[PDB]
Amino acid sequence: DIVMSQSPSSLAVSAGEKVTMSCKSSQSLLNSRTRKNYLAWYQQKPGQSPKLLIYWASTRESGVPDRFTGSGSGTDFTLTITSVQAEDLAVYYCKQSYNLRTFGGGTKLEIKRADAAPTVSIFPPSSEQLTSGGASVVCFLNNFYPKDINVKWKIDGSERQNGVLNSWTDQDSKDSTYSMSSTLTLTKDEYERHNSYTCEATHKTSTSPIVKSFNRNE
Amino acid sequence: EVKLVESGGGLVQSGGSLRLSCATSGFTFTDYYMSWVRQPPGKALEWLGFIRNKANGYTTEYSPSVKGRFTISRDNSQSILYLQMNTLRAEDSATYYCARDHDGYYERFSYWGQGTLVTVSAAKTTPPSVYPLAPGSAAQTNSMVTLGCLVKGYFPEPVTVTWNSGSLSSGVHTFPAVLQSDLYTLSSSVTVPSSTWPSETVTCNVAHPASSTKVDKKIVPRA
């Protein structure tokens, strides 16, 4: 088959900057019958259907802004985005149409912004969940940047790693912050054995962990 | 306006079969090639096949990964595109998109459908448990307050969560679902002014179309 290779896999830039990203095929995409390179660029914003930006390597799809530019010939192709906006965050795919079709693996575009510390909140098991035999302790770590963040759970001062599942939102398009849930699941038996529950966010906006807590005695 | 609407997605056992549909309108179906493309959750797009226009005899092509196993066809009187998936495997789980296509000789605007989700698994369709997240009873008020809903034990995807039937959509964070004991769990947070709750109502609305279920969960203060 023809193989399609994008690089880099990910990149982050600030609002108003330029980006470029590469796409390389294992074989020439030039059809000398028509003198066009059968290469195309797609934008897939999170939770949406892919949208075609560029075809024939550099012809813009009707109604695509001029700040997106395709270039290259043969085996080597480049997409350029001029003055990157917040709304451009998305995965960009190249697609050859010279023989059948095949997509590259994609380049993820992330919007840079000022660092920001998470708003942390902690929630004990709901009483409704407790009647079912389960116990889930929840922490929300909301509206922080950058994405890298550490969460530690303590039960009566003592760290717990098993039973913890973490899930990050896609980068907000509006303000560009990330959010994350951490959920500590336990048996009701174990939950009612201990009193003090704690979740701690270590993020590079401080050397001090942000800590929220609750005590079942209070 | 051109439209392409994929249907026929759903849950099917390993080794089973499934037929996807793509209903089209707003263009002469018969003049276009049509492609199917799939995307597993959190993975790349994969082109699967096309079927050519009337002038090319409606012949078919397929990626290697599905040739011999998936079949594309078209009903030209009703303007519908089909993908017959046979011998399903776990790896086939993905969103499937139909796209209008063409030999790139002439310029034509690209249309794609919204997609349809296929899930190949031994797990069964299971409605969600919906649990309210109100602050602890010893929690103290301030300028903003965060409430949540924990959505646990459902299958397959998707679920959608809203707050006060869509009235609260600012300061909402709905996290991606994670597989736990082969069932999905997700949570959603909403942050409002403390003046507005609990004086006024906050309810999350969880919709799970696969089990034909909608749950409204009012968040009340504990104790």
Side-chain angles (χ1 to χ4, degrees):
Chain A
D1 328 340
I2 296 175
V3 169
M4 305 299 305
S5 326
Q6 289 173 252
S7 53
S9 310
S10 179
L11 83 171
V13 308
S14 309
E17 278 188 47
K18 181 204 278 272
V19 304
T20 54
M21 57 196 96
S22 174
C23 169
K24 299 193 186 171
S25 52
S26 71
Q27 189 185 133
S28 192
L29 310 177
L30 181 56
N31 192 5
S32 277
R33 283 271 291 101
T34 193
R35 310 195 165 170
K36 302 288 161 163
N37 291 278
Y38 281 15
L39 189 274
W41 285 93
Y42 281 85
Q43 155 173 87
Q44 194 182 34
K45 298 177 183 184
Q48 316 180 190
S49 301
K51 179 172 89 79
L52 173 49
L53 297 175
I54 307 292
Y55 65 92
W56 295 343
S58 54
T59 311
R60 281 179 201 91
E61 185 80 305
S62 170
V64 172
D66 329 85
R67 60 192 197 74
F68 293 92
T69 307
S71 67
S73 191
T75 69
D76 271 56
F77 300 89
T78 278
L79 181 60
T80 288
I81 311 176
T82 261
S83 69
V84 173
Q85 307 302 313
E87 225 169 20
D88 301 336
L89 85 93
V91 179
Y92 292 82
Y93 293 97
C94 72
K95 188 206 82 186
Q96 72 84 19
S97 65
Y98 175 82
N99 188 240
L100 277 39
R101 293 87 173 89
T102 149
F103 289 87
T107 291
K108 188 172 273 168
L109 171 49
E110 316 182 336
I111 309 306
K112 235 173 290 197
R113 59 151 286 147
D115 300 357
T119 311
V120 191
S121 22
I122 194 166
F123 301 85
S126 67
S127 41
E128 171 179 349
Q129 186 190 24
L130 290 165
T131 69
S132 79
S136 292
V137 198
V138 183
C139 253
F140 297 125
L141 302 272
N142 288 337
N143 297 120
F144 65 88
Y145 187 88
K147 194 175 177 181
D148 205 53
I149 187 162
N150 176 250
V151 178
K152 186 189 265 57
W153 282 98
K154 297 175 178 183
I155 311 183
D156 286 345
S158 149
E159 180 162 5
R160 179 63 92 271
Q161 74 277 104
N162 290 301
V164 176
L165 300 175
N166 295 331
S167 171
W168 282 252
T169 51
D170 295 324
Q171 212 193 299
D172 192 337
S173 210
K174 177 187 175 154
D175 74 356
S176 303
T177 56
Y178 297 96
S179 294
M180 114 145 213
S181 59
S182 187
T183 303
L184 169 49
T185 292
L186 295 166
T187 59
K188 183 169 155 219
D189 260 305
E190 210 193 338
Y191 169 75
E192 322 225 295
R193 275 198 270 284
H194 298 274
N195 300 303
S196 301
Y197 289 89
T198 268
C199 103
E200 300 177 14
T202 302
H203 191 240
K204 32 54 54 70
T205 39
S206 193
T207 51
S208 303
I210 291 170
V211 186
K212 287 282 182 294
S213 76
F214 68 90
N215 196 325
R216 299 173 54 238
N217 304 138
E218 299 177 36
Chain B
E1 52 133 51
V2 167
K3 52 182 171 83
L4 305 180
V5 177
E6 303 89 338
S7 72
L11 170 54
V12 57
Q13 285 195 236
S14 190
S17 264
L18 200 61
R19 200 195 59 178
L20 272 19
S21 284
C22 170
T24 80
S25 56
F27 61 99
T28 62
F29 186 53
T30 253
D31 294 343
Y32 289 86
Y33 291 32
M34 305 287 297
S35 268
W36 287 102
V37 183
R38 72 176 178 189
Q39 177 165 44
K43 293 191 195 190
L45 293 180
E46 183 182 13
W47 179 86
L48 294 183
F50 63 45
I51 184 162
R52 299 190 174 79
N53 54 17
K54 182 178 262 191
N56 285 278
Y58 308 128
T59 60
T60 57
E61 307 293 352
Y62 302 96
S63 45
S65 61
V66 304
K67 184 162 48 161
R69 200 162 70 74
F70 286 12
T71 307
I72 296 170
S73 59
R74 56 196 297 160
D75 179 327
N76 300 309
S77 53
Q78 292 182 250
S79 301
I80 296 184
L81 173 76
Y82 298 106
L83 175 72
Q84 175 58 41
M85 300 163 76
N86 293 317
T87 326
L88 286 166
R89 62 218 280 179
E91 303 85 85
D92 299 329
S93 298
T95 297
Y96 286 71
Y97 294 104
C98 69
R100 201 175 70 160
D101 206 331
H102 56 106
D103 56 62
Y105 177 40
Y106 289 107
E107 300 106 324
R108 296 291 185 267
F109 194 106
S110 163
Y111 290 94
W112 286 51
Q114 82 293 346
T116 191
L117 188 70
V118 178
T119 312
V120 183
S121 176
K124 298 202 92 105
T125 298
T126 308
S129 293
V130 176
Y131 302 132
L133 314 172
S137 60
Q140 292 295 304
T141 67
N142 229 356
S143 97
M144 306 299 273
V145 60
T146 290
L147 280 9
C149 282
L150 171 56
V151 185
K152 195 164 172 61
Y154 71 87
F155 199 85
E157 284 273 63
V159 163
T160 48
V161 173
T162 57
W163 290 96
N164 291 342
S165 315
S167 303
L168 296 172
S169 55
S170 199
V172 168
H173 300 281
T174 287
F175 300 91
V178 173
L179 215 49
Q180 182 181 27
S181 296
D182 214 344
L183 297 174
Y184 283 101
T185 289
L186 71 64
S187 55
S188 169
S189 68
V190 69
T191 291
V192 308
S194 319
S195 47
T196 204
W197 181 93
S199 61
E200 309 301 295
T201 297
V202 180
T203 296
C204 76
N205 319 110
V206 176
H208 185 230
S211 61
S212 306
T213 299
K214 305 188 195 182
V215 180
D216 300 312
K217 194 106 261 175
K218 187 185 170 184
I219 308 292
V220 298
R222 301 158 185 251

mmCIF file of all heavy atoms in Angstrom, chain B residues 17-40:
data_model
loop_
_atom_site.group_PDB
_atom_site.id
_atom_site.type_symbol
_atom_site.label_atom_id
_atom_site.label_comp_id
_atom_site.label_asym_id
_atom_site.label_seq_id
_atom_site.Cartn_x
_atom_site.Cartn_y
_atom_site.Cartn_z
ATOM 1 N N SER B 17 -22.637 -9.959 12.600
ATOM 2 C CA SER B 17 -22.740 -9.213 11.354
ATOM 3 C C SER B 17 -23.575 -7.963 11.615
ATOM 4 O O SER B 17 -24.390 -7.939 12.530
ATOM 5 C CB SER B 17 -23.455 -10.045 10.285
ATOM 6 O OG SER B 17 -22.528 -10.703 9.442
ATOM 7 N N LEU B 18 -23.390 -6.945 10.783
ATOM 8 C CA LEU B 18 -24.176 -5.725 10.905
ATOM 9 C C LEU B 18 -24.180 -4.948 9.597
ATOM 10 O O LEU B 18 -23.160 -4.890 8.907
ATOM 11 C CB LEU B 18 -23.578 -4.880 12.007
ATOM 12 C CG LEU B 18 -24.418 -3.793 12.660
ATOM 13 C CD1 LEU B 18 -25.676 -4.316 13.368
ATOM 14 C CD2 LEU B 18 -23.496 -3.126 13.653
ATOM 15 N N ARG B 19 -25.318 -4.358 9.252
ATOM 16 C CA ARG B 19 -25.414 -3.568 8.028
ATOM 17 C C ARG B 19 -25.619 -2.132 8.410
ATOM 18 O O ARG B 19 -26.580 -1.810 9.099
ATOM 19 C CB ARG B 19 -26.560 -4.037 7.128
ATOM 20 C CG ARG B 19 -26.398 -3.581 5.690
ATOM 21 C CD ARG B 19 -27.672 -3.729 4.870
ATOM 22 N NE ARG B 19 -28.775 -2.964 5.447
ATOM 23 C CZ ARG B 19 -30.000 -2.867 4.934
ATOM 24 N NH1 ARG B 19 -30.321 -3.465 3.784
ATOM 25 N NH2 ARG B 19 -30.913 -2.144 5.579
ATOM 26 N N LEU B 20 -24.703 -1.273 7.973
ATOM 27 C CA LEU B 20 -24.828 0.171 8.161
ATOM 28 C C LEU B 20 -25.525 0.773 6.957
ATOM 29 O O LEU B 20 -25.387 0.258 5.872
ATOM 30 C CB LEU B 20 -23.454 0.798 8.352
ATOM 31 C CG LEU B 20 -22.841 0.896 9.750
ATOM 32 C CD1 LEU B 20 -23.451 -0.024 10.789
ATOM 33 C CD2 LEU B 20 -21.324 0.782 9.709
ATOM 34 N N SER B 21 -26.270 1.857 7.161
ATOM 35 C CA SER B 21 -26.925 2.605 6.064
ATOM 36 C C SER B 21 -26.421 4.021 6.045
ATOM 37 O O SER B 21 -26.057 4.559 7.086
ATOM 38 C CB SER B 21 -28.437 2.683 6.256
ATOM 39 O OG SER B 21 -29.073 1.475 5.936
ATOM 40 N N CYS B 22 -26.400 4.614 4.857
ATOM 41 C CA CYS B 22 -26.203 6.043 4.703
ATOM 42 C C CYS B 22 -27.247 6.586 3.729
ATOM 43 O O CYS B 22 -27.179 6.348 2.522
ATOM 44 C CB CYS B 22 -24.786 6.323 4.266
ATOM 45 S SG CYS B 22 -24.449 8.020 3.772
ATOM 46 N N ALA B 23 -28.245 7.270 4.280
ATOM 47 C CA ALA B 23 -29.296 7.923 3.498
ATOM 48 C C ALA B 23 -28.788 9.299 3.030
ATOM 49 O O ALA B 23 -28.371 10.098 3.858
ATOM 50 C CB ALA B 23 -30.574 8.092 4.342
ATOM 51 N N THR B 24 -28.812 9.560 1.718
ATOM 52 C CA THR B 24 -28.325 10.826 1.155
ATOM 53 C C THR B 24 -29.451 11.586 0.473
ATOM 54 O O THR B 24 -30.420 10.998 0.031
ATOM 55 C CB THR B 24 -27.172 10.626 0.117
ATOM 56 O OG1 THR B 24 -27.689 10.233 -1.181
ATOM 57 C CG2 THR B 24 -26.169 9.566 0.605
ATOM 58 N N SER B 25 -29.278 12.893 0.357
ATOM 59 C CA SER B 25 -30.209 13.742 -0.376
ATOM 60 C C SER B 25 -29.493 15.014 -0.775
ATOM 61 O O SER B 25 -28.387 15.290 -0.287
ATOM 62 C CB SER B 25 -31.411 14.092 0.520
ATOM 63 O OG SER B 25 -30.978 14.709 1.721
ATOM 64 N N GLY B 26 -30.119 15.775 -1.670
ATOM 65 C CA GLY B 26 -29.589 17.060 -2.119
ATOM 66 C C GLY B 26 -28.533 17.053 -3.237
ATOM 67 O O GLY B 26 -27.932 18.073 -3.500
ATOM 68 N N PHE B 27 -28.275 15.894 -3.844
ATOM 69 C CA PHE B 27 -27.376 15.754 -5.010
ATOM 70 C C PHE B 27 -27.774 14.493 -5.748
ATOM 71 O O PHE B 27 -28.485 13.664 -5.193
ATOM 72 C CB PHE B 27 -25.895 15.699 -4.609
ATOM 73 C CG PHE B 27 -25.519 14.529 -3.712
ATOM 74 C CD1 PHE B 27 -24.927 13.387 -4.244
ATOM 75 C CD2 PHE B 27 -25.712 14.583 -2.333
ATOM 76 C CE1 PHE B 27 -24.556 12.318 -3.436
ATOM 77 C CE2 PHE B 27 -25.341 13.498 -1.509
ATOM 78 C CZ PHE B 27 -24.759 12.373 -2.068
ATOM 79 N N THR B 28 -27.332 14.360 -6.992
ATOM 80 C CA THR B 28 -27.619 13.177 -7.798
ATOM 81 C C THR B 28 -26.653 12.070 -7.349
ATOM 82 O O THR B 28 -25.464 12.067 -7.706
ATOM 83 C CB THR B 28 -27.449 13.462 -9.300
ATOM 84 O OG1 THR B 28 -26.087 13.825 -9.529
ATOM 85 C CG2 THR B 28 -28.367 14.625 -9.757
ATOM 86 N N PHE B 29 -27.178 11.163 -6.535
ATOM 87 C CA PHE B 29 -26.413 10.087 -5.878
ATOM 88 C C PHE B 29 -25.508 9.368 -6.861
ATOM 89 O O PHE B 29 -24.320 9.161 -6.633
ATOM 90 C CB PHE B 29 -27.408 9.063 -5.295
ATOM 91 C CG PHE B 29 -26.788 7.965 -4.467
ATOM 92 C CD1 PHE B 29 -25.930 8.249 -3.410
ATOM 93 C CD2 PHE B 29 -27.137 6.647 -4.685
ATOM 94 C CE1 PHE B 29 -25.420 7.227 -2.609
ATOM 95 C CE2 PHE B 29 -26.630 5.634 -3.890
ATOM 96 C CZ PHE B 29 -25.773 5.923 -2.859
ATOM 97 N N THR B 30 -26.147 9.027 -7.962
ATOM 98 C CA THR B 30 -25.652 8.194 -9.030
ATOM 99 C C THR B 30 -24.376 8.756 -9.694
ATOM 100 O O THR B 30 -23.581 7.987 -10.199
ATOM 101 C CB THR B 30 -26.888 7.913 -9.969
ATOM 102 O OG1 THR B 30 -27.340 6.548 -9.821
ATOM 103 C CG2 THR B 30 -26.641 8.204 -11.337
ATOM 104 N N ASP B 31 -24.165 10.081 -9.662
ATOM 105 C CA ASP B 31 -22.955 10.717 -10.195
ATOM 106 C C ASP B 31 -21.714 10.656 -9.277
ATOM 107 O O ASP B 31 -20.633 11.092 -9.682
ATOM 108 C CB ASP B 31 -23.197 12.218 -10.485
ATOM 109 C CG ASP B 31 -24.198 12.470 -11.606
ATOM 110 O OD1 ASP B 31 -24.484 11.558 -12.390
ATOM 111 O OD2 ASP B 31 -24.701 13.610 -11.697
ATOM 112 N N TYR B 32 -21.839 10.169 -8.048
ATOM 113 C CA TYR B 32 -20.698 10.230 -7.136
ATOM 114 C C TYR B 32 -20.190 8.880 -6.707
ATOM 115 O O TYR B 32 -20.922 7.901 -6.657
ATOM 116 C CB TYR B 32 -21.039 11.065 -5.896
ATOM 117 C CG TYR B 32 -21.158 12.545 -6.214
ATOM 118 C CD1 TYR B 32 -22.365 13.095 -6.681
ATOM 119 C CD2 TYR B 32 -20.075 13.386 -6.068
ATOM 120 C CE1 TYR B 32 -22.470 14.446 -6.997
ATOM 121 C CE2 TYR B 32 -20.179 14.729 -6.361
ATOM 122 C CZ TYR B 32 -21.375 15.254 -6.821
ATOM 123 O OH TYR B 32 -21.446 16.606 -7.098
ATOM 124 N N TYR B 33 -18.914 8.867 -6.345
ATOM 125 C CA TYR B 33 -18.336 7.771 -5.596
ATOM 126 C C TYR B 33 -18.796 8.000 -4.159
ATOM 127 O O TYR B 33 -19.063 9.158 -3.755
ATOM 128 C CB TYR B 33 -16.811 7.807 -5.602
ATOM 129 C CG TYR B 33 -16.056 7.529 -6.895
ATOM 130 C CD1 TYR B 33 -16.548 7.870 -8.160
ATOM 131 C CD2 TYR B 33 -14.792 6.983 -6.827
ATOM 132 C CE1 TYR B 33 -15.803 7.615 -9.309
ATOM 133 C CE2 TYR B 33 -14.034 6.732 -7.957
ATOM 134 C CZ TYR B 33 -14.526 7.049 -9.185
ATOM 135 O OH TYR B 33 -13.726 6.746 -10.252
ATOM 136 N N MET B 34 -18.857 6.932 -3.363
ATOM 137 C CA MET B 34 -19.100 7.097 -1.933
ATOM 138 C C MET B 34 -18.099 6.244 -1.161
ATOM 139 O O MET B 34 -17.869 5.068 -1.497
ATOM 140 C CB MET B 34 -20.515 6.695 -1.584
ATOM 141 C CG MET B 34 -21.617 7.408 -2.369
ATOM 142 S SD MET B 34 -21.863 9.135 -1.897
ATOM 143 C CE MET B 34 -22.368 8.881 -0.208
ATOM 144 N N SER B 35 -17.513 6.851 -0.136
ATOM 145 C CA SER B 35 -16.550 6.199 0.727
ATOM 146 C C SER B 35 -17.127 5.944 2.109
ATOM 147 O O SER B 35 -17.969 6.712 2.606
ATOM 148 C CB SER B 35 -15.296 7.037 0.877
ATOM 149 O OG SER B 35 -14.309 6.699 -0.079
ATOM 150 N N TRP B 36 -16.656 4.863 2.731
ATOM 151 C CA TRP B 36 -16.801 4.672 4.167
ATOM 152 C C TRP B 36 -15.452 4.837 4.876
ATOM 153 O O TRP B 36 -14.427 4.368 4.400
ATOM 154 C CB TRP B 36 -17.362 3.302 4.452
ATOM 155 C CG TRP B 36 -18.811 3.072 4.131
ATOM 156 C CD1 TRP B 36 -19.294 2.417 3.052
ATOM 157 C CD2 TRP B 36 -19.957 3.395 4.953
ATOM 158 N NE1 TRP B 36 -20.668 2.343 3.124
ATOM 159 C CE2 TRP B 36 -21.091 2.924 4.287
ATOM 160 C CE3 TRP B 36 -20.124 4.046 6.189
ATOM 161 C CZ2 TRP B 36 -22.398 3.102 4.793
ATOM 162 C CZ3 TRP B 36 -21.412 4.189 6.706
ATOM 163 C CH2 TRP B 36 -22.528 3.721 6.006
ATOM 164 N N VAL B 37 -15.467 5.524 6.017
ATOM 165 C CA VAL B 37 -14.288 5.759 6.834
ATOM 166 C C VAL B 37 -14.615 5.457 8.303
ATOM 167 O O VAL B 37 -15.675 5.815 8.761
ATOM 168 C CB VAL B 37 -13.844 7.234 6.743
ATOM 169 C CG1 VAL B 37 -12.564 7.457 7.535
ATOM 170 C CG2 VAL B 37 -13.669 7.687 5.266
ATOM 171 N N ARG B 38 -13.708 4.829 9.048
ATOM 172 C CA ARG B 38 -13.967 4.571 10.474
ATOM 173 C C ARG B 38 -12.910 5.151 11.397
ATOM 174 O O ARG B 38 -11.775 5.396 10.979
ATOM 175 C CB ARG B 38 -14.126 3.075 10.744
ATOM 176 C CG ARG B 38 -12.866 2.243 10.662
ATOM 177 C CD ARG B 38 -13.145 0.791 11.054
ATOM 178 N NE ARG B 38 -11.947 -0.037 10.941
ATOM 179 C CZ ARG B 38 -11.914 -1.372 11.044
ATOM 180 N NH1 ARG B 38 -13.033 -2.087 11.226
ATOM 181 N NH2 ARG B 38 -10.735 -2.003 10.934
ATOM 182 N N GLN B 39 -13.288 5.369 12.655
ATOM 183 C CA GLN B 39 -12.347 5.890 13.679
ATOM 184 C C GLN B 39 -12.617 5.252 15.017
ATOM 185 O O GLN B 39 -13.578 5.627 15.645
ATOM 186 C CB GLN B 39 -12.523 7.413 13.812
ATOM 187 C CG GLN B 39 -11.659 8.081 14.877
ATOM 188 C CD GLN B 39 -11.599 9.593 14.705
ATOM 189 O OE1 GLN B 39 -12.623 10.254 14.461
ATOM 190 N NE2 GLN B 39 -10.390 10.151 14.802
ATOM 191 N N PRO B 40 -11.772 4.309 15.482
ATOM 192 C CA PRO B 40 -11.981 3.836 16.853
ATOM 193 C C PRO B 40 -11.897 4.990 17.839
ATOM 194 O O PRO B 40 -11.353 6.038 17.465
ATOM 195 C CB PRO B 40 -10.834 2.825 17.087
ATOM 196 C CG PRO B 40 -10.348 2.454 15.745
ATOM 197 C CD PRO B 40 -10.678 3.598 14.812
#
